[PDB]
């Protein structure tokens, strides 16, 4: 479960990151 979470976070992170540099 914790793992789910960090993951699911850790790739919104990165889709908003990306999301920003566009
Ligand atoms: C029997 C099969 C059952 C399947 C199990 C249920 C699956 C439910 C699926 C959920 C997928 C939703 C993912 C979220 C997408 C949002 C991107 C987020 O993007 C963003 O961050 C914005 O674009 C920022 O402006
Ligand atoms: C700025 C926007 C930030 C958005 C933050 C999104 C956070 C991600 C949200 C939830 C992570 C929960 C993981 C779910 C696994 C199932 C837990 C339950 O698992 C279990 O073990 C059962 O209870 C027992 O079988």
Redesign the pocket.
Known sequence: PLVVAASIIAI?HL??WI?DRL
Do not use: K, P
Request: no cysteine.
């Open positions: 919104l889709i908003l999301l």
